[PDB]
Ligand binder design. Structure first.
Ligand code: CLA
Ligand code: CLA
Ligand code: CLA
Ligand code: CLA
Ligand code: CLA
Ligand code: CLA
Ligand code: CLA
Ligand code: CLA
Ligand code: CLA
Ligand SMILES: CCCCCCCCCCCCCCCCCC(=O)O[C@@H](COC(=O)CCCCCCCCCCCCCCC)COP(=O)(O)OC[C@H](O)CO
Lengths: 42, 143, 95, 31, 153, 742, 147
């Protein structure tokens, strides 16, 4: 299990997980707040 | 006092069937190299000019066009078959120059009696700038 | 020597060692007729001198090319004759 | 007199022939 | 009306562009029955387009003569949300990422084989240092003041 | 002697080697000291010959990698069948194939990309596909989405089985070396059990399933009312109504009264007028005959029983006066070198793919395939590219054999030695052939361009000018047009409609195939093709022959197969390796295939594809301008590139806008490749020095020291991005042009 | 040196063809030549500058002469618009007849090239109005080149 967790900590697997989570977050943000050209909250 | 071994023209050649990578006009108007070795067993080797030849038992003589070919073949013989080799340079005038072991000992290992040519008693970064050698034939590395 | 078996290097014989051979040159005598040879010898003598032949070739070629180009008939080359057509206007009115 | 018909062959054909002939003879010299 | 630009909510060309978009979407919509899934998708796209145009009009954007909104980055307070506020947010996030990466590189600098901690990321230390970039401006300012940001070699 | 030689549990299944990167070799498992190591870790990953010197482990790794590749292929096939079951309009396309565009992919409604869901027809919005899976499924008798779902599930199960087999045959029960070297039994099983039995089973499927379902479909019967394929198996009378010979059973086969089967086994030829494809009875008889031929061709080589042939004896029996000892010693070379087998199989598979593309364009074997212009163009272009890549890889691995696995002390072949002895003559003669072909093929185009630009159209090499007519190809076309008359009296029609005659097949107002005319333009393009192929052959064969030694570097084999150079000496020894010869030949293969696909696209758009009017006239897409415009480079630039790029540059705002974006991105990537192709490592390393100083100033420099890409890696990146951009450009341009107008 | 190039002994004895190349791209780099001093380098630079001035003047004189001899400057002065300038005449033996048709522009009697260098407007603005002025200017520039 330690070796498998070490494999999960290697550069491509960790990069894939991180970038997939980031892409999912950005896609969900773009669904819930679509067509954002300005920052109108202030 | 090592004396260079004389070339034996009557040395038999390896059994080869002919290749297009051999000698050319440069062998006639200019020099060509000749490598001689002593095979203890009739075996088969790979020519540096492409293809494979069959060396015969005893002394063997091979004429090639470049010194690099002679040295590559000699390195192959020494590493793979463990054969002592010497190659010469032959001019169209018939002159023979004994080339490779200049003192009978291989250049990789140290041997007394060799003189230093191209020796600079400084580090490489202590070379003189080109502006200080301008308008003179001397190069910074030659000083 | 060079001609013995399994040996191809001779110090006293370099031309055979280095392959200095006439592969297709033949020492056979002249097959042409003697009168033919004499006629071609006396009728091609002025072209023997190579520098004179070079100068003569350059001068004759230049002179003949200039003479042909300058005095060519007008109906041979389309550039020698003019347009023989009315010129057309530009896409903004000749400007 | 039609001057292009004389000078255009001279500059495009005769002069280049003379120039490359002279340069080929000068380059291949062994002084 | 900065730089001769009409506001997008008072621009005829903006409404014209919305009209062309809605007309093209209706022309695509006419090929299917209204109770079908492609018709519902097209209707959702039209509603999204209407909401987008209304939001662009109400956001205060200045529309050019071609009917498209033009951003002003000169610093005008009416248009601070086009460049300056998103720019500050981006600078904060980028400083977060850079500070976290620099902290991770500093932490694994004095090891036996630091390169092994670069091909294989040590996740607990990285997750410990992830939230240290939340206060990255304060930490960076103090490190610059104490002369720890730069290395004098 | 040919037994199952398998050792049990050779490799322990564990994640320890997963945790250590680069475990396979020694110089890499020590850990990264620079960034270059990372690239090396992706360069020697599948080079099993360098990891170990034992052939057994290499062969086992090869076998399990093949299993993993088969699992990936089965997974991909399951995905295509699933995306044809769900998210597709296959059932709608079955009713109206001539007006509904095939589609099997739908995009999600995010960031405005839902514009890519185009109105393909059949009450469906999605991306139009050009892989021609719908035509395969119609030719297979599939009339429902449940069948596609079942096929997807079965392919998923088969992918899992392939993955389990790959794990099993390496980690649990691995074959021995003598198991792999039993080439005779392998050939027997792959000719009789793989190809022969596979062809027999597919012929059985076509006879029992595809023929009645397709007969019902072409009879106008609604697809949902067609009887299920198993109903035609349990009820023999249902199949007997369409084909009465089925009432006789298999007794005509067993009594050699095969002529009774002349209702579903016909040598008809031509195309089906209803569907525009080959007759399915013709395909059934073809696969039956192929199965018989392969099954009797698979009992040739010797095995445990004394009957059969020995490959070694067959090779040793062929030797001539010119070749000396002949093919003796080739068996030991081919049975102990995986790279030689890879070279041979890659060359054969690339040539097979090329001939596959030509024969699919010339004979569409699926219903409503010829009238789908996008499918035809995509299939031809794709298989052309695949064949070219495999042919290049053939020489790429022949060079590896010559560098690594070649030695004359043991495993000596006389033919290879005699080839290597006169390699200068071969290379010089091929060089002269390339120069002569280039001059007399492209200088003709230059001559035509100059004559047209000078206002001398009578001096060009045109049909209305000096004519270079392909008399040989026209004679071949004429001979094959009259083949049913004398040479093949048992065939009703010719083997294709691309030879001649008054025949013409049109389905749904679109032309399927026409007799293709051959003129001066085709002559020039074909000789351009020959020139490009000969130059690519020259580069690849020169690399293969001089991969070991030459007059410049007599010890090039000691430097390796893949090395950058030998320094700036001898005037410069840049790109002397055979890997660089492959890298150069990649561009020329790209050029050749690009010219081939441009020729195909323009010729079929101008002289074959088009529309049929109700009166009877035919109007083509480009109006038949190939004969007069393609003879000049300006014609290719204007009437082919400029004219047909209007469908890809004006695709913005519509469903084809992804093709315009890919057009621009492919142009960008092709330009980006020139940075790697034109530059050198030293400048980038010196710039990286300054960037490293900037990072070190702020204590942010990494322990892995940044290094510029190596010379070979720089060339590889350049050629990879070059091929990717220059191929995706043609992909987007072809797809947008042939979908918008076809 | 005994062989071309004579300014480089290292290139002269080269048995390959690169010598022929390398004697061209090193001809004007005096600082890398053989047996050169500072004053000789400066004098060579001075002489090459004089030569370059001569070619510049000769090129300008050729432009003026060809505009005067084959152009339409006099007819362009009267109508600066609706008249295309003519740089020089075209005499191509390889020309076809439609090439002669299409290239006959302006008031010319044969094929001509339309000047796009703007020399017509520049000469018209600064006072030149007739072809004899262009001939005199070409003669003066030729004299300057000789000087
Ligand atoms: C040069 C840089 C660049 C910049 C500055 C922008 C800028 C923008 N893009 Mg564009 N874009 C670019 C390049 C760029 N793009 C490229 C190369 C592509 C092709 C791949 C695109 C394709 C593209 C698409 C497809 C879309 C945009 C959109 C957007 C907008 C923001 C998206 C969003 O809603 O964020 C919302 C806010 C955030 C995600 C902030 C996250 C902060 C986290 C949550 C932390 C919170 C802090 C505690 C904004 C106008 C969107 C749009 O609608 O434009 C009008 C959109 O749909 N872009
Ligand atoms: C710049 C100068 C130049 C000039 C003046 C010409 C001139 C001409 N071209 Mg061209 N040509 C050029 C450059 C030039 N070329 C280049 C660079 C190329 C290579 C792309 C070509 C390729 C080319 C081809 C392939 C052909 C021509 C031909 C033609 C002829 C046009 C029609 C005609 O007159 O036929 C009438 C022709 C003749 C009566 C020939 C007269 C030549 C005289 C009598 C020969 C004696 C002297 C001769 C010039 C050589 C010696 C001089 C010097 C070397 C010492 C004409 C001679 C045609 C040709 O000449 O073939 C018939 C033709 O087929 N040219
Ligand atoms: C050959 C490869 C292949 C390819 C290229 C595609 C391509 C596509 N699929 Mg298909 N598919 C395949 C095989 C393939 N499929 C197989 C074998 C099946 C059977 C299970 C399916 C069943 C399927 C479904 C059920 C769906 C798609 C969808 C999609 C789209 C991507 C959406 C998505 O996955 O993002 C999300 C990506 C993630 C990383 C989320 C996590 C998923 C894990 C990591 C994947 C592996 C887990 C098992 C895209 C068109 C979607 C679609 O088109 O809907 C409109 C969708 O809903 N596919
Ligand atoms: C008649 C039976 C037979 C069959 C069908 C095959 C078929 C195949 N072999 Mg060959 N092979 C055989 C006998 C057979 N072999 C023998 C006796 C030997 C030893 C001398 C070899 C040695 C051999 C090697 C060394 C390799 C192959 C490979 C392959 C595959 C390449 C072709 C391809 O992928 O097409 C696609 C074909 C199919 C998917 C159609 C269905 C075939 C099914 C799935 C295969 C089941 C066949 C198997 C032999 C029997 C089951 C065993 C049982 C314990 C379960 C293919 C699955 C190559 C490979 O890809 O390996 C993974 C490979 O590396 N074969
Ligand atoms: C010049 C004549 C010649 C030609 C044209 C070919 C051409 C062909 N041969 Mg080869 N072959 C030759 C001589 C020739 N061979 C000789 C003299 C031998 C005896 C050593 C072989 C041995 C041989 C075998 C044993 C096989 C081929 C196969 C094939 C075809 C490969 C199929 C492919 O593309 O992959 C597409 C996919 C597959 C079907 C192939 C799967 C991969 C195979 C099984 C791996 C090759 C392994 C091989 C035994 C190497 C082991 C090394 C060992 C010593 C350690 C290809 C068309 C294969 C074939 O019969 O296919 C029907 C095959 O099984 N060849
Ligand atoms: C048919 C199967 C096949 C097989 C099994 C092999 C087998 C092998 N090849 Mg050969 N080869 C083939 C076909 C094949 N080749 C073809 C068709 C070509 C022509 C291009 C070559 C050309 C070739 C070269 C030039 C070299 C080899 C070498 C090798 C060895 C190591 C491979 C490596 O480590 O890469 C591991 C994997 C990678 C490096 C992947 C690279 C990524 C590729 C280039 C990108 C593909 C782009 C993709 C479609 C775009 C998507 C975008 C992206 C964002 C995802 C191995 C023996 C190498 C060798 O033996 O070294 C001594 C080597 O030098 N091969
Ligand atoms: C696009 C322009 C281009 C051109 C014209 C060439 C030209 C050529 N390539 Mg190169 N090449 C190119 C791009 C190009 N390459 C690129 C991008 C690469 C990177 C991969 C290479 C890499 C490369 C390789 C690896 C090889 C070549 C080879 C060849 C030669 C074979 C063709 C032949 O000799 O036919 C005859 C000549 C031509 C078609 C060139 C145009 C000549 C026209 C038809 C006539 C010109 C008129 C006449 C000479 C009058 C002159 C006028 C006068 C004033 C001088 C030829 C010199 C092959 C070779 O060496 O084989 C012999 C070879 O192996 N090339
Ligand atoms: C204002 C005028 C000017 C002058 C007087 C010089 C002067 C000099 N330059 Mg500079 N140079 C200039 C502008 C100028 N340069 C410009 C605009 C560029 C950018 C294109 C360069 C780039 C440059 C380079 C890259 C090099 C020099 C070097 C030199 C020497 C000339 C080399 C030679 O023999 O000819 C060589 C040229 C030809 C005779 C023909 C070959 C190339 C032609 C132009 C083909 C293009 C058509 C000389 C000291 C060379 C030197 O060795 O310096 C130490 C050298 O390496 N120059
Ligand atoms: C007052 C007298 C005098 C004059 C007239 C000159 C003039 C000249 N000298 Mg100098 N010189 C002098 C004194 C003088 N010198 C003295 C006393 C010494 C010794 C200390 C030198 C030492 C010297 C050396 C060593 C050299 C020169 C050089 C030159 C020439 C420079 C090249 C050129 O033509 O520039 C042309 C430039 C202009 C007329 C003005 C500058 C142009 C500006 C930047 C552009 C803006 C102008 C305008 C927009 C133009 C419009 C263009 C039109 C088409 C519309 C020029 C002829 C070089 C030489 O002689 O070459 C042969 C050189 O090598 N000189
Ligand atoms: C021009 C190309 C010349 C290639 C000559 C190759 C050669 O040596 O000739 C062989 C072939 O001779 C030819 O007929 C050459 C044909 C030349 C044309 C090749 C292209 C195909 C058309 C000799 O065959 P063989 O019967 O002596 O032995 C062959 C083998 O080892 C089996 O015994």
């Amino acid at each position: 299990m330690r070796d498998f967790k070490t494999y999960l900590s290697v550069a491509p697997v960790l990069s894939t997980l991180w970038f997939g989570s980031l892409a999912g977050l950005l896609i969900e943000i773009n669904r819930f707040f679509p067509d954002a050209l300005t920052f109108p909250f202030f | 006092g090592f004396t260079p071994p004389e070339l034996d023209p009557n040395t038999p050649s390896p059994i080869f069937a002919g290749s297009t990578g051999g000698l050319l006009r440069k062998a006639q108007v200019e020099e060509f190299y000749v490598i001689t070795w002593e095979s203890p067993k009739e075996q088969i080797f790979e020519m540096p000019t492409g293809g494979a030849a069959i060396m015969r038992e005893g002394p063997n003589l091979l004429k090639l066009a470049r010194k690099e070919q002679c040295l590559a073949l000699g390195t192959r013989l020494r590493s793979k078959y463990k054969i002592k080799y010497q190659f010469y340079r032959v001019f169209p005038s018939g002159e023979v120059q004994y080339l490779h072991p200049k003192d009978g000992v291989y250049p990789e290992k140290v041997n007394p009696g060799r003189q230093g040519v191209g020796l600079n008693m400084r580090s490489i970064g202590k070379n003189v700038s080109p502006i200080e050698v301008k308008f003179t034939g001397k190069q910074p590395y030659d000083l | 020597k060079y001609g013995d078996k399994s040996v191809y290097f001779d110090l006293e014989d370099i031309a055979n060692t280095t392959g200095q051979w006439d592969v297709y040159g033949s020492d056979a005598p002249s097959p042409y007729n003697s009168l033919q040879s004499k006629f071609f010898e006396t009728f091609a003598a002025p072209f023997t001198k190579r520098g004179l032949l070079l100068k003569f070739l350059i001068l004759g070629g230049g002179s003949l090319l200039t003479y042909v180009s300058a005095n060519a008939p007008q109906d041979v080359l389309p550039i020698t004759r003019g347009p023989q057509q009315p010129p057309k206007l530009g896409p903004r009115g000749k400007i | 007199m039609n001057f292009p018909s004389i000078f255009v062959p001279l500059v495009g054909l005769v002069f280049p022939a003379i120039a490359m002939a002279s340069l080929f003879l000068y380059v291949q010299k062994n002084k | 009306d900065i730089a001769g630009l009409t506001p997008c909510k008072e621009s005829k060309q903006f409404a014209k562009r919305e009209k062309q978009a809605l007309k093209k979407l209706q022309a695509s919509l006419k090929l299917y029955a209204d109770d079908s899934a492609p018709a519902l998708a097209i209707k959702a796209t039209m509603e999204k387009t209407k909401k987008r145009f209304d939001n662009y009009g109400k956001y205060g954007l200045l529309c050019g003569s071609d009917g498209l909104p033009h951003l002003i980055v000169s610093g005008d307070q009416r248009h601070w949300g086009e460049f300056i506020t998103p720019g500050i947010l981006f600078l904060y996030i980028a400083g977060w990422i850079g500070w976290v990466g620099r902290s991770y590189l500093i932490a694994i600098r004095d090891e036996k084989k630091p390169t092994q901690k670069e091909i294989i990321i040590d996740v607990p230390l990285a997750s410990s240092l992830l939230f240290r970039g939340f206060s990255w401006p304060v930490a960076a300012y103090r490190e610059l003041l104490n002369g720890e940001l730069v290395d004098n070699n | 002697e040919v037994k199952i030689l398998v050792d049990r549990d050779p490799v322990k299944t564990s994640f320890e080697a997963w945790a250590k990167p680069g475990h396979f070799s020694r110089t890499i498992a020590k850990g990264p000291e620079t960034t270059t190591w990372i690239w090396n870790l992706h360069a020697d990953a599948h080079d099993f010959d360098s990891h170990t010197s034992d052939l057994e482990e290499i062969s086992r790794k090869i076998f399990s990698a093949h299993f993993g590749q088969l699992s990936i292929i089965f997974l991909w096939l399951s995905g295509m069948y699933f995306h044809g079951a769900r998210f597709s309009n296959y059932e709608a396309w079955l009713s109206d194939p001539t007006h509904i565009g095939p589609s099997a992919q739908v995009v999600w409604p995010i960031v405005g990309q839902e514009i890519l869901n185009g109105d393909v027809g059949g009450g469906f919005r999605g991306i139009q596909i050009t892989s021609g899976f719908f035509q395969i499924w119609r030719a297979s008798g599939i009339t429902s989405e449940l069948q596609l779902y079942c096929t997807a599930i079965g392919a998923l199960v088969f992918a899992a089985l392939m993955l389990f087999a790959g794990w099993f045959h390496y980690h649990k029960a691995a074959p021995k070396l003598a198991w792999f070297q039993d080439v005779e039994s392998m050939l027997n099983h792959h000719l009789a059990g793989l190809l022969g039995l596979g062809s027999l089973s597919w012929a059985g499927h076509q006879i029992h399933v595809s023929l009645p379902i397709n007969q019902f479909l072409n009879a106008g019967v609604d697809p949902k009312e067609i009887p299920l394929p198993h109903e035609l198996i349990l009820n023999r009378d249902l199949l007997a109504q369409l084909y009465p010979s089925f009432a006789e059973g298999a007794t005509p086969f067993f009594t050699l009264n095969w002529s009774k089967y002349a209702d579903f086994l016909t040598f008809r030829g031509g195309l089906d007028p209803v569907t525009g494809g080959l007759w399915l009875t013709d395909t059934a008889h073809h696969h039956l005959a192929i199965a018989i031929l392969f099954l009797i061709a698979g009992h040739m080589y010797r095995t445990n029983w004394g009957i059969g042939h020995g490959l070694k004896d067959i090779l040793e029996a062929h030797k001539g006066p010119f070749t000396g000892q002949g093919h003796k010693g080739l068996y030991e070379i081919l049975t102990t070198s995986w790279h030689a087998q890879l070279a041979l199989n890659l060359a054969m598979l690339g040539s097979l793919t090329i001939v596959v593309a030509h024969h699919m364009y010339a004979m569409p074997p699926y219903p409503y395939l010829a009238t789908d212009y996008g499918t035809q163009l995509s299939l031809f272009t794709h298989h052309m590219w695949i064949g070219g890549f495999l042919i290049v890889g053939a020489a790429a691995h022949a060079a590896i054999f010559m560098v690594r696995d070649y030695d004359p002390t043991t495993r000596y072949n006389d033919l290879l030695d005699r080839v290597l002895r006169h390699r200068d003559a071969i290379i010089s003669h091929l060089n002269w052939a390339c120069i002569f072909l280039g001059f007399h093929s492209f200088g003709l185009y230059i001559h035509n361009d100059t004559m047209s630009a000078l206002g001398r159209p009578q001096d060009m090499f045109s049909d209305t000018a000096i004519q270079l007519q392909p008399v040989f190809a026209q004679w071949i076309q004429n001979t094959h047009a009259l083949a049913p008359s004398a040479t093949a009296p048992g065939a009703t029609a010719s083997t294709s409609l691309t030879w001649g005659g008054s025949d013409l097949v049109a389905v749904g107002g679109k032309v399927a195939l026409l007799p293709i005319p051959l003129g001066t333009a085709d002559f020039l393009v074909h000789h351009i093709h020959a020139f490009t192929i000969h130059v690519t052959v020259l580069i690849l064969l020169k690399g293969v022959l001089f991969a070991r030694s030459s007059r410049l570097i007599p010890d090039k084999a000691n430097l390796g197969f893949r090395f950058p150079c030998d320094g700036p000496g001898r005037g410069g020894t840049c790109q002397v390796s055979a890997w660089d010869h492959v890298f150069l030949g990649l561009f020329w293969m790209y050029n050749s295939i690009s010219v081939v696909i441009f020729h195909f696209s323009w010729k079929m758009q101008s002289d074959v594809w088009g529309s049929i009017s109700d009166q009877g006239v035919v109007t083509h897409i480009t109006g038949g301008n190939f004969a007069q415009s393609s003879i000049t480079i300006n014609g290719w630039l204007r009437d082919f590139l400029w004219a047909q790029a209007s469908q890809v540059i004006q695709s913005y705002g519509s469903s084809l806008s992804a093709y315009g974006l890919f057009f621009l991105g492919a142009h960008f990537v092709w330009a980006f490749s020139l940075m790697f192709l034109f530059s050198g490592r030293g400048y980038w390393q010196e710039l990286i020095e300054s960037i490293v100083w900037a990072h070190n100033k702020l204590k942010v420099a990494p322990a892995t020291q940044p290094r510029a890409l190596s010379i070979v890696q720089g060339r590889a990146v350049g050629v990879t991005h070059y091929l990717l951009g220059g191929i995706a450009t043609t992909w987007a341009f072809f797809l947008a042009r042939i979908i918008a107008v076809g | 040196a005994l062989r071309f190039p004579r300014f480089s002994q290292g290139l002269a004895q080269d048995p390959t063809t690169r010598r022929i190349w390398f004697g061209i791209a090193t001809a004007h780099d005096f600082e890398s030549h053989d047996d050169i001093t500072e004053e000789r380098l400066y004098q060579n630079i001075f002489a090459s500058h004089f030569g370059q001035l001569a070619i510049i003047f000769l090129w300008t004189s050729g432009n003026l002469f060809h505009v005067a001899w084959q152009g339409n400057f006099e007819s362009w002065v009267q109508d600066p618009l609706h008249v295309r300038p003519i740089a020089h005449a075209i005499w191509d033996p390889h020309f076809g007849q439609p090439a002669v048709e299409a290239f006959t522009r302006g008031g010319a009697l044969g094929p001509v090239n339309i000047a796009y260098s703007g020399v017509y407007q520049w000469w018209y603005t600064i006072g030149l109005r007739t072809n004899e002025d262009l001939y005199t200017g070409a003669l003066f520039l030729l004299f300057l080149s000789v000087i």
